[PDB]
Amino acid sequence: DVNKVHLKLEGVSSPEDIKLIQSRLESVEGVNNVECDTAGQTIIVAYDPDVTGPRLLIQCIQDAAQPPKYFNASLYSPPKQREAERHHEIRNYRNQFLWSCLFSVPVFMFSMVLPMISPFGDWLFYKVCNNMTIGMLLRWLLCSPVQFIIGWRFYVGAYHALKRGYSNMDVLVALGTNAAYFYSVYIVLKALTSESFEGQDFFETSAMLISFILLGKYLEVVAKGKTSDALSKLTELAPETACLLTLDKDGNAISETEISTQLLQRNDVIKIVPGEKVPVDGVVIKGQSHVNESMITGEARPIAKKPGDKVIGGTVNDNGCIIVKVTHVGSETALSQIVQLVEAAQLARAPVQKLADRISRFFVPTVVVAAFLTWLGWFVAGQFDIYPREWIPKAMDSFELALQFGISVLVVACPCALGLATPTAVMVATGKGASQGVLIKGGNALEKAHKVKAIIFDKTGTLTVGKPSVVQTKVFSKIPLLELCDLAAGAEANSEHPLSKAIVEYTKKLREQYGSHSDHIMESKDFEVHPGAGVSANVEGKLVLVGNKRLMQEFEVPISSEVEGHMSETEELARTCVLVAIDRTICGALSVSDPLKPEAGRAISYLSSMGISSIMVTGDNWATAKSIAKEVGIGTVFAEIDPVGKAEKIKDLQMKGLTVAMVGDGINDSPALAAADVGLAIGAGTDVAIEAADIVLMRSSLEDVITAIDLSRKTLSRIRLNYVWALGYNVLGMPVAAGVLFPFTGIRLPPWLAGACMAASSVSVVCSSLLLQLYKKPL
């Protein structure tokens, strides 16, 4: 996408379009730089949003035409083109597989199956000349398509790679596929050279090996493609709906109209009726409206949009009429910002890949030299005839068997678990993370999180909720709860502050608990603005004095023994409380508690049994944190500790060698994440979670953590198995068909068979690394 909209003009390459636009640009204002457009392909003049953009510039380009018909321009730039490009990649590899299969399969078929039932095998044996038959010729002819045409990638893979050295997969693939066919050419040349020469040849090896390697490559890339668009859900909140509320000079009204994102630039106002999808990243000017959204968190946020509030684009209005002006472009659109994260999802670097490539530099030259030694062994042995010669297979002698066991090693070479398995597993892990709502921004984090048995936690929406919920009214003198809600609302109706707003939240809460409007709401009399001890008010004719015991003494309200009882109850768990005196007589208290993130019973009391130890170092006061620890599990607790203390303690704990992680969201909580090995964020309300972080989660429910860590460990399960499998199947079966051993104990294995022996250990590896797909969260 570009800020110079790529608009192709009406009239199929008609220059007068450009001439008229040039005249208009000389006429109209607002352009940053009026420059040539004939040299460019579209309107390539310099401009930017806000001062100009969709509305004004579309109007100008349209009006460039002779009135009333206009050069109708809306927008033309890649809306979402990754899908098409990746689908073309899939089609390319699909086409390569299709061609490579069609020629290869008959080639394998000819000298494998036909001799068994051979009414046609004699036709193959029908000699063209002195030992050069029809079958051999046709098989040779149908071999250039395989390596000389289709497999050229391998060559271009190796061409520069071996030009200086240090090798890779390409080297072994190239040598193994080339040697068999190239020696097969020589053997058939010597076959045609005489009439007493013996047959046997090897073409099927190369075709089969190339086909299977290409199939593996196809599976790898298609899995990359599938997991790449598995981000899906994240950016598909794409709104095209819009409105234009044309206003007069005083902004009263001119005309409301339905439009699209065609003309949406900044300073564009939209009316959002209920149900209608919100336009691209607007902000409310005036109007109170309930609207729900869920963008950087997964547990949803309902907000009563006041006259001025961030109404995120692509969301759902519940109820209300609001004027929504566009004031954001580019990255400030949350969709775009988290698309920089799906772009960051395309950014990763496996640390295990380092060890993989280090192994790759020890394997290939060593295996080549070990294979080479075999030919010298058999050759020196056969030249100086110092061993018996009566088990030599018929129609053969020295130069056959020597080079045959020589070639029989570069076809049994196993590595496909060093080139395919690890990238595939790493990518599928990220795909599953995105599936469950995790953005693992780097394989480094995935590898690091494998070995952790202790984590850090924090308040402020990581183990808590927002403003605390009122939980306990003791009702000293009998006043109905809903009547208390009405009285509290009437008293709070003046001087609205977040704690008083929380009192009104308790009001509302008990209202949905009861159901239905009650009595009447009376605005406060004798109102005194003082939240230091509680405000003075008169509601329903009753002197509602909401305020602590200090206020009860201030306004001379009777004190009962239940006052001291509830004081003791408050000091038990450090609720933070306030007294409500109706008619200047205390009618119960209004105790408030801050709810935690309430799944700890299932989550933290049980992941510890799975093998972690909860370390809770946090900012809230000593009493609050010790009570939180007293609620459920968690061991050592360090309260009254500012984010700095979290930083030092985590530093020493990681230095001791436990790789302790932290779970916490907030600007102040950020350095703790930065200094720590890996981070982990439930919800992305803080911007630093979108910034440098490791295991950013879509939702805010901490259950994800379980689903996170096990998954990582589970990944490093399968990978290790593959590193065993090779270090299994590779060296206990390679020396079988590697010569050197065989002058003591016989029994054959033919060179062609290893072609379908590397094959099995080149697909099952991918199957093991792909079975990561089927997975479920434990609890």
Residue numbers in the entry: 184 to 962
What does the paper say about this structure?
Copper transporting P-type ATPase proteins are key regulators of cellular copper and are found in all kingdoms of life. To further dissect the transport and regulation mechanisms of P1B-1-ATPases, we focused on a member from rice (Oryza sativa), OsHMA4, or simply HMA49. This protein is localized to the tonoplasts of roots, and is involved in root-to-shoot translocation and grain accumulation of copper. HMA4 has three predicted N-terminal ferredoxin-like MBDs, although the one closest in sequence to the M-domain and the P-type ATPase core, MBD−1, lacks the metal-binding CXXC-motif.
We also studied the effect of no such supplementation to HMA4, which has previously yielded an early E1 state of AfCopA26. These various conditions yielded four structures, determined at overall resolutions of 3.3 (HMA4BeF), 3.2 (HMA4AlF), 3.6 (HMA4apo), and 3.7 Å (HMA4Cu). In comparison to available structural information on P1B-1-ATPases, HMA4apo/Cu are most alike the early inward-open E1 structure of AfCopA (RMSD 4.1 and 3.8 Å), while HMA4AlF/HMA4BeF are most reminiscent of the outward-facing structure of LpCopA captured using AlF4- (RMSD 1.8 and 1.7 Å). Collectively, these observations suggest the HMA4BeF/HMA4AlF structures represent early E2 conformations linked to copper release, likely E2P, while the HMA4apo/HMA4Cu rather represent early E1 states associated with copper uptake. The shifted CPC-region suggests the stretch is highly dynamic, as also observed for the E1-Cu state of AfCopA, which is consistent with a role in uptake, high-affinity binding and release. Accordingly, in contrast to AfCopA, in HMA4apo the cysteines of the CPC-motif point away from the proposed entry site, facing M3, M5, and M6, as if the protein is not yet ready to accept its cargo in the absence of metal. A In the E1 state (HMA4apo) the first of the CPC cysteines (C597 of M4) is oriented away, preventing copper uptake. This configuration is stabilized by Y912, N913 (M5) and S945 (M6). In HMA4apo these amino acids interact tightly with the sidechains of the central cysteines, with C597 being wedged in-between Y912 and N913, and with a strong interhelical cryo-EM density feature in-between C599 and S945. In line with this, the available experimental data indicate absence of the feature at the MB’ platform when copper is not available, such as in our HMA4apo/HMA4BeF/HMA4AlF, all XtATP7B and the apo hATP7B (PDB-ID 7XUN33) structures. C Close-view of the A-domain-MBD−1 interaction in the E1 state (HMA4apo).
